[PDB]
Amino acid sequence: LPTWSLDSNGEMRSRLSLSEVLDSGDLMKFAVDKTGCQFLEKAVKGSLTSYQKFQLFEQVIGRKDDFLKLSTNIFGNYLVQSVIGISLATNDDGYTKRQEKLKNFISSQMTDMCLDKFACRVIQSSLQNMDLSLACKLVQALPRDARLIAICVDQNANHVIQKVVAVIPLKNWEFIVDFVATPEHLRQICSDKYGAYVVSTIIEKLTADSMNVDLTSAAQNLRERALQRLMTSVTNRCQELATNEYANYIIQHIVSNDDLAVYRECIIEKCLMRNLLSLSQEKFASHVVEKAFLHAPLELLAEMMDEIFDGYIPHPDTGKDALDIMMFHQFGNYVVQCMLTICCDAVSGRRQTKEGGYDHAISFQDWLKKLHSRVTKERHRLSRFSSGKKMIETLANLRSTH
RNA sequence: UGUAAAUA
Numbered sequence: 001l002p003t004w005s006l007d008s009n010g011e012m013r014s015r016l017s018l019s020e021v022l023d024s025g026d027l028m029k030f031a032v033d034k035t036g037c038q039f040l041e042k043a044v045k046g047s048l049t050s051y052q053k054f055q056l057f058e059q060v061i062g063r064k065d066d067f068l069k070l071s072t073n074i075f076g077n078y079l080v081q082s083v084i085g086i087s088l089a090t091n092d093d094g095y096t097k098r099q100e101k102l103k104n105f106i107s108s109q110m111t112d113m114c115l116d117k118f119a120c121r122v123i124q125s126s127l128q129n130m131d132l133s134l135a136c137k138l139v140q141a142l143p144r145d146a147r148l149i150a151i152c153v154d155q156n157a158n159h160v161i162q163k164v165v166a167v168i169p170l171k172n173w174e175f176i177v178d179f180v181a182t183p184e185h186l187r188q189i190c191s192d193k194y195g196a197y198v199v200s201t202i203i204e205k206l207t208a209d210s211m212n213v214d215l216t217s218a219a220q221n222l223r224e225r226a227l228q229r230l231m232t233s234v235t236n237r238c239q240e241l242a243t244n245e246y247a248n249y250i251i252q253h254i255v256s257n258d259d260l261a262v263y264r265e266c267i268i269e270k271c272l273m274r275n276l277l278s279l280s281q282e283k284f285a286s287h288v289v290e291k292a293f294l295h296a297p298l299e300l301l302a303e304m305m306d307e308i309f310d311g312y313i314p315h316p317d318t319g320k321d322a323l324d325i326m327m328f329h330q331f332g333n334y335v336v337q338c339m340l341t342i343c344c345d346a347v348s349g350r351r352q353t354k355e356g357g358y359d360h361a362i363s364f365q366d367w368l369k370k371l372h373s374r375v376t377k378e379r380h381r382l383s384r385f386s387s388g389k390k391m392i393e394t395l396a397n398l399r400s401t402h
Numbered sequence: 403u404g405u406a407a408a409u410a
Contacts, residue, residue, distance in 0.1 A: 034410065037410080038410080041410090074409070074410065075409095075410055077409070077410090078409085078410070117408070117409060118409060120408080120409090121408090121409060154408095155407075155408060156408055156409090157408095158407070158408085159407075159408060162407090193406065193407070194406095194407060194408090196406070196407095197406075197407055198407095245405065245406075246405085246406060248405075248406090249405080249406060283404065283405070284404095284405060286404070287404080287405070330403065330404070331403090331404055333403075333404090334403085334404065385403075386403055387403065
């Protein structure tokens with residue numbers, strides 16, 4: 001910190017004015033000091049004369065090197081964000097040259113700033129506050145090569161991609177959907193902790209739900225196309241993603257969203273059907289199997305039920321069947337509980353049994369009677385287990401209501 | 403009895 005601005009105790013002075021700092025040429029020393037930048041952040045929020053704004057503009061966002069030094073700084077990045085907001089609120093003659101220059105600074109250093117803990121906040125701020133036409137040019141500065149994978153899986157930069165998805169029209173970031181849909185890229189990005197949030201946010205934005213009713217028809221076509229490109233890649237690697245520690249959330253998200261119903265159905269048939277017993281015994285995919293049971297259309301649900309009750313040859317020596325395996329399995333037991341809960345919800349009115357022009361009530365009662373007979377016959381072994389006690393209780397609570 | 407995001 002500069003000595004001219006200190007007391008005889010070594011502390012910063014009170015009664016210090018913004019203009020003294022701006023006139024001193026020492027702003028950069030204040031902006032990276034906690035006490036200095038705290039002073040600047042309060043001063044910058046008050047009434048500013050035209051010349052004060054002018055100095056802040058040239059000293060904070062006017063030269064590329066100091067702008068980057070401040071943007072990547074623990075304290076400075078906050079001052080940068082405030083001065084950008086003031087710049088956007090000041091419609092003087094130099095407005096346009098200020099905003100284009102800000103676009104050029106960030107554009108030339110887009111990748112490095114995205115991956116920085118502090119500069120990625122300057123990017124996120126600019127994307128949602130700048131004029132949309134300039135914000136779109138920032139998006140265009142994103143890399144199209146291996147760096148984009150790194151950006152998606154970065155603990156900081158993944159939030160830049162999600163911000164783009166939230167506040168920029170799809171036409172400007174459609175290249176990201178096609179980048180991510182390329183099979184090798186999709187594999188790397190969905191099987192990563194941060195990348196899986198990225199893919200899920202994209203899918204949500206490409207979904208024709210109540211949050212997108214404001215799109216034009218043309219924009220809905222654009223959206224539907226990008227959605228179908230991505231769902232085609234997701235459904236081709238569907239087994240791999242369903243069993244992965246992070247990507248299983250993407251499959252669950254698709255399967256449980258009614259506004260993705262046609263993709264729910266492709267996933268169930270392409271990936272889960274004929275593999276229900278195997279996937280019910282997987283740590284991560286057993287969650288996907290639960291979502292499938294909870295949200296399948298009723299004629300697929302019938303096939304899923306029939307696969308569990310009758311799809312597998314019993315063990316040649318013991319006669320154990322799929323239901324026997326699943327009820328006592330560390331993950332499969334949660335899928336049987338889900339099947340039981342669906343059936344008790346149906347017969348008690350908690351779940352609508354009318355679907356495609358028919359009341360499937362008779363089918364839920366069939367499946368329930370199967371579970372009830374099994375749980376009755378095996379009640380002694382089942383009562384040794386928490387899951388088993390819960391099914392016995394679930395059936396006892398049903399006959400109490402009905 | 404079973405799994406997921408970063409600034410004073």
